[PDB]
Amino acid sequence: DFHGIDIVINHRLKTSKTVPDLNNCKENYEFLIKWTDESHLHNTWETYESIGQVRGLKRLDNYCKQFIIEDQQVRLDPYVTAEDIEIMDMERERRLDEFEEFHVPERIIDSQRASLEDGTSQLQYLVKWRRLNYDEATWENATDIVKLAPEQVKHFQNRENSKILPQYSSNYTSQRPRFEKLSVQPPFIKGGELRDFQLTGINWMAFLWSKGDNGILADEMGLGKTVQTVAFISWLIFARRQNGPHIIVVPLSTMPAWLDTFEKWAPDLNCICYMGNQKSRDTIREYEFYTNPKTMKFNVLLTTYEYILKDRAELGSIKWQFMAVDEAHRLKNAESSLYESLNSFKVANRMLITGTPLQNNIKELAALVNFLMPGRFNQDEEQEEYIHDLHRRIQPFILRRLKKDVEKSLPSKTERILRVELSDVQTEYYKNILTKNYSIMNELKKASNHPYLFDNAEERVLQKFMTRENVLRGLIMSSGKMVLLDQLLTRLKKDGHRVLIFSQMVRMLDILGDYLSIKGINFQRLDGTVPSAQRRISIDHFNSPDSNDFVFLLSTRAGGLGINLMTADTVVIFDSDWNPQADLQAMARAHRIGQKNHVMVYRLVSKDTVEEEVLERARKKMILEYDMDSIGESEVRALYKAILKFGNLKEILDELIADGTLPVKSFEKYGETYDEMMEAAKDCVHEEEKNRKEILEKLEKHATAYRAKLKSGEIKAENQPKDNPLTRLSLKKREKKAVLFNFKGVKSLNAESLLSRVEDLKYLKNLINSNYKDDPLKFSLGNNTPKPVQNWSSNWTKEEDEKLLIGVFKYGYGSWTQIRDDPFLGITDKIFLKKVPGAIHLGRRVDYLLSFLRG
DNA sequence: GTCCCCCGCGTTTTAACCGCCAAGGGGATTACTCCCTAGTCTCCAGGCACGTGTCAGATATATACATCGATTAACGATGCTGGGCATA
DNA sequence: TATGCCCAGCATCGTTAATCGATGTATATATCTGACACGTGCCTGGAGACTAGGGAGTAATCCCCTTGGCGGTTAAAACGCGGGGGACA
Numbered sequence A: 001d002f003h004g005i006d007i008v009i010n011h012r013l014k015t016s017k018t019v020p021d022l023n024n025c026k027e028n029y030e031f032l033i034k035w036t037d038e039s040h041l042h043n044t045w046e047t048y049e050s051i052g053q054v055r056g057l058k059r060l061d062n063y064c065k066q067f068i069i070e071d072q073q074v075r076l077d078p079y080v081t082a083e084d085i086e087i088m089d090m091e092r093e094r095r096l097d098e099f100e101e102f103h104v105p106e107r108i109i110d111s112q113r114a115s116l117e118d119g120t121s122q123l124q125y126l127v128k129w130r131r132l133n134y135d136e137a138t139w140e141n142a143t144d145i146v147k148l149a150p151e152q153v154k155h156f157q158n159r160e161n162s163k164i165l166p167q168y169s170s171n172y173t174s175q176r177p178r179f180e181k182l183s184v185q186p187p188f189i190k191g192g193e194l195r196d197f198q199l200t201g202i203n204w205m206a207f208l209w210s211k212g213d214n215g216i217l218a219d220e221m222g223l224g225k226t227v228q229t230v231a232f233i234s235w236l237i238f239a240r241r242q243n244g245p246h247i248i249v250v251p252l253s254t255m256p257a258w259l260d261t262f263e264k265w266a267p268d269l270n271c272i273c274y275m276g277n278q279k280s281r282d283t284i285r286e287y288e289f290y291t292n293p294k295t296m297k298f299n300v301l302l303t304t305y306e307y308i309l310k311d312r313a314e315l316g317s318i319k320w321q322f323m324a325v326d327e328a329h330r331l332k333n334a335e336s337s338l339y340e341s342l343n344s345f346k347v348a349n350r351m352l353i354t355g356t357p358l359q360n361n362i363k364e365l366a367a368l369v370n371f372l373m374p375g376r377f378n379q380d381e382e383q384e385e386y387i388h389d390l391h392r393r394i395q396p397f398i399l400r401r402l403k404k405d406v407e408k409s410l411p412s413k414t415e416r417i418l419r420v421e422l423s424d425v426q427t428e429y430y431k432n433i434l435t436k437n438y439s440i441m442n443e444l445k446k447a448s449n450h451p452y453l454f455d456n457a458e459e460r461v462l463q464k465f466m467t468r469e470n471v472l473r474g475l476i477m478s479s480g481k482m483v484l485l486d487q488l489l490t491r492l493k494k495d496g497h498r499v500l501i502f503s504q505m506v507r508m509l510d511i512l513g514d515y516l517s518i519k520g521i522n523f524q525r526l527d528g529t530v531p532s533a534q535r536r537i538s539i540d541h542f543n544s545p546d547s548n549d550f551v552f553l554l555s556t557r558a559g560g561l562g563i564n565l566m567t568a569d570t571v572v573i574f575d576s577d578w579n580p581q582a583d584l585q586a587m588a589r590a591h592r593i594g595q596k597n598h599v600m601v602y603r604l605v606s607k608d609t610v611e612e613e614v615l616e617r618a619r620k621k622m623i624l625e626y627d628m629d630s631i632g633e634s635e636v637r638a639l640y641k642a643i644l645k646f647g648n649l650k651e652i653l654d655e656l657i658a659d660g661t662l663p664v665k666s667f668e669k670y671g672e673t674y675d676e677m678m679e680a681a682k683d684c685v686h687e688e689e690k691n692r693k694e695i696l697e698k699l700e701k702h703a704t705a706y707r708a709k710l711k712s713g714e715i716k717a718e719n720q721p722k723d724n725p726l727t728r729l730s731l732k733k734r735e736k737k738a739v740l741f742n743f744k745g746v747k748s749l750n751a752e753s754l755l756s757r758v759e760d761l762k763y764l765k766n767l768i769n770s771n772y773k774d775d776p777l778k779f780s781l782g783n784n785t786p787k788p789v790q791n792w793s794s795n796w797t798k799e800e801d802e803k804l805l806i807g808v809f810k811y812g813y814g815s816w817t818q819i820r821d822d823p824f825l826g827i828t829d830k831i832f833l834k835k836v837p838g839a840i841h842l843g844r845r846v847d848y849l850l851s852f853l854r855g
Numbered sequence B: 001g002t003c004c005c006c007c008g009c010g011t012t013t014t015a016a017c018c019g020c021c022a023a024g025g026g027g028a029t030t031a032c033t034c035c036c037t038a039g040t041c042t043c044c045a046g047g048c049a050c051g052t053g054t055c056a057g058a059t060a061t062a063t064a065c066a067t068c069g070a071t072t073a074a075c076g077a078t079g080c081t082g083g084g085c086a087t088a
Numbered sequence C: 001t002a003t004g005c006c007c008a009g010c011a012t013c014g015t016t017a018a019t020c021g022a023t024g025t026a027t028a029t030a031t032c033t034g035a036c037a038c039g040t041g042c043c044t045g046g047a048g049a050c051t052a053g054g055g056a057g058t059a060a061t062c063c064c065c066t067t068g069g070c071g072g073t074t075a076a077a078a079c080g081c082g083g084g085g086g087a088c089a
């Protein structure tokens, strides 16, 4: 709640030497300081004497110290070169790129109208910013959000209008509907077009979904397995009416990719994922349900694997029906916490999208069999029968679509091995370790390709004297993979290719980080240490067509974790990571469909070592490649309110039923009840006129009979008789009754408001649609000025009359709960419940505006 | 910085120590026999692992009843305000 | 023509009644997990039964060791006095 210093944004000078001290930073430089408990849009250039003693001051002292050292490294040092200027100056634009992303929103979480100190109540939005966790979500008023990013406000209103709550979802658990194998594509792909095997896979998932069974999508990496999942979920929600919540577990590295693809292909569905640790959990819990002792405002989310094990009570207390997972190789063993954790969620159908090798161990395939079908089910001689029965037994429940059907638009594939010999350092480090001197088992396998893995190893090679070229010279010649890697790297640099290096050891990545940095090679690492905010900037920087990073380092599990590289084509592997097909899936992050200049792969096989035996063992595990017509009282009243709000409901009834008011009935019954209500209304008005005119005639006869006795002189003039036909006739002219009729128990139903409501709403639909159909925010009236206000505590002009009809045109009459919360009108502090703007007091004003426009 | 409880030291008072002799309880040795143990067999039922089963608590869950919160349609009485009718 | 007089006209205030929805409270039912008792099956580590032998019981004798009593010197414990130096605040 305190207004202290959070972080530092930018820095410059305030008043327009060898080393500026802190005093020069006080009386000579101003710094852009970001305050805590506040958005990044309130950054002010402050120093020390302008704010005084405030909470938090050491951060700016350390930042100013790094700025002093930076100034000592820009032009106040005789040892600086040329690349150091581009690096130190590159950090400036780097921090600017990491700070400008906090000013643009990305999502509006909630929208609660809070009161101020002057008594007014303004609607503030829970703004979510870009490249930031769910924390630090500040409330911003609706007076400047619509003036900066209207797409987030319009989409935020679209999430509330498109009511896809689970209470509207169908319940085909007792009987599945008739399924039809489609061939075309549904009009929901707004991103791009699809081929044939995508729609075939969708027809397979929906083909098996109608039978109450689950399958495994085992296609090739790159055939659009993510798009088929989003299209299958969207088609299942909007087709089979399955708007219920669907949990899709996605790793944290691929979560932003699935968010961008999900919003790019299906923008009509929200994608509120689950990230953070503590406060973000409170954000997801406060956004999950309402503060009451069951308001489902979500459906599709993304949960990381660790977030499942960390939070089992929050996710386990919610019902689910569909489960999707990318890279489902984590379920290799049936004795893990994730395997028993996913089986605890009461779901209905599952779907496994992965390509794990189900041939090296039977517990993997069997684990994937009993994972979705609990109950279903060695020697080399009986293996032909075991796979002869299990093969065709599992074929109807698996998709095996090879890449041979998509090679018509893909470049050729090739791979060349390279048996690299050892050197003298690898000989002494390969023989002298298992003797006497040390200076257990896996350390030899790790040191079978690079000696620099301990401590007493760099000073042993350096037999002379700080130098720089001698260290790198003694570093490249220590192993053959460095000399051959530098020669092949130079050969690829003579033409122009994007080369990748996949390594298992995390220390070798740092060794390459110290070797490639001296040679002037711009690159960026990617392992399991940096957070998503950094690796996402690195990958988004590598995907640029003008990127100068021709080398991009990865890892094994982190390298083949997810996402993809489109501009990469060359994949260099130091050694096999002790896993079959791990190299195929590792090259799958670069060798993809978007690549056009082919793919060249070099495997640095260590000759006469220990990795060739592991490679042979990996080849051994690779050769195996085998009531509807019933309308109750609440339906008559709710339908009557639907007529009072929307009028004619024979054209947008599908939108007036899915809102949650009208139950699931037949449209013909709504049409018949509507025709009977309107017909009985018109007939009741006609009878009301035929009888009312007769009553008026009787009051004219009795009134004349009273006047005949009044003009004679039989009535005293001292007291005027109030009980005469004249008074009851005058009160009959100003009668306080309406055309009422009881329809099927429901009493107090007016017929004039229905006809006049259809006329007013019809004149509004034809008036707005007959002039501005695709731009309702540009409708005008001209010179038609109605009567002024009657003592109102707010300014009201013609613009309020023009924008006031927009809310009635969109939401309808009587829906003042959405008009006061609409930021596209400007009447935020002009609609209340003591006060002048009332509910019916303004509605009758709208009726006066419509009656004024009709005349 | 103060006060009084220990050490050092001379003399007064008790009992430890050494020498001698006595007497008998109790420990040390021995011989014989007889109960109690290790050793050896057979047997299982005691015990170990595990599937199967209804009952403590705990968690909702469809259904019904009672009590408001708040909203909207309806009714009693106008207040200037607008649109026309008899007089300066 | 301007100024008081007749006839509507919506919004001002207040009050009644029907309705959707939230809150509180039962009430019999369908899961959830955690079992402790039983029967399933099997091992044999105990029980059961018998033998054989040598330890330990006891009894009968021995003689060493422990307790006792006594009296003479001769050091030791006991006492006090006095004042210094360590405890304690």
Ligand SMILES: Nc1ncnc2c1ncn2[C@@H]1O[C@H](COP(=O)(O)OP(=O)(O)O)[C@@H](O)[C@H]1O
Binding pocket: A192, A193, A194, A195, A198, A221, A222, A223, A224, A225, A226, A227, A326, A563, A564, A594
């Ligand atoms: N239907 C499609 N049409 C065109 N391109 C597609 C389609 N589906 C996927 N892609 C391409 O595939 C890339 C995404 O890869 P993706 O299939 O999501 O990886 P994964 O193997 O994790 O599913 C995108 O860059 C996109 O260009």
Ligand code: BEF
Binding pocket: A220, A221, A222, A327, A562, A563, A564, A588, A589
């Ligand atoms: F093969 Be995908 F990129 F997971």
